[PDB]
Design a protein around this ligand. Sequence first.
Ligand code: HEM
Length: 180
Amino acid sequence: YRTASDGSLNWGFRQSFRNYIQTGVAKGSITLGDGASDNGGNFAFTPRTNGTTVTSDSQGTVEFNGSVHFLGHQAEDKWILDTTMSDIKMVFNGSSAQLVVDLVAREFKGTTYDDIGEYIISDDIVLADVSLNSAADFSQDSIDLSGTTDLTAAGAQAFGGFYETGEALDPTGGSLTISS
Ligand code: HEM
């Protein structure tokens, strides 16, 4: 039995999006919950107790504590951009990983304040593919989470279609310690 007992995934999705929300035309806010930390905009998520499943030295899943709530485009008393990301998971396959999230997000209806989307629940969405700097090996004492990230087709759609499929996101960072 091996489990991720310490460390953090450090990832703020995409700096241009955080800037878009906080200082750009969205004029909104970012709020972290459930244990996530800011860590300079490279949001830090801790591994969840019992959150590690290992199927092979190079394959497994680590579930993380934390959530991110994006708000933008305040129209009347509603926010037209209202996206919550939770249940963050990292699924490892050697030098590759996937970043999986649950999303609760208003549908994008167009670039007007004359219309607002209803909340769409998107569970278990693969948001990004990760190219890890080093191969994940759950038989070792640590896993380096550093790597580059590509947005998936479904992630692009979940974020209003403004990004193209395969677009680069923030690189992943951090590390986990694995023990018995
Ligand atoms: C659910 C609703 C919405 C979502 C998910 C969404 C998402 C996004 C995303 C991901 C970007 C790219 C930001 C970046 O990284 O550069 C963007 C940019 C932009 N969006 Fe939104 N958006 C929404 C609603 C709206 C609305 C209602 C408007 C206008 C009425 C709008 C106008 C814009 C503009 C002008 C940009 C370009 C900003 C820039 O380049 O400075 N969006 N949006």
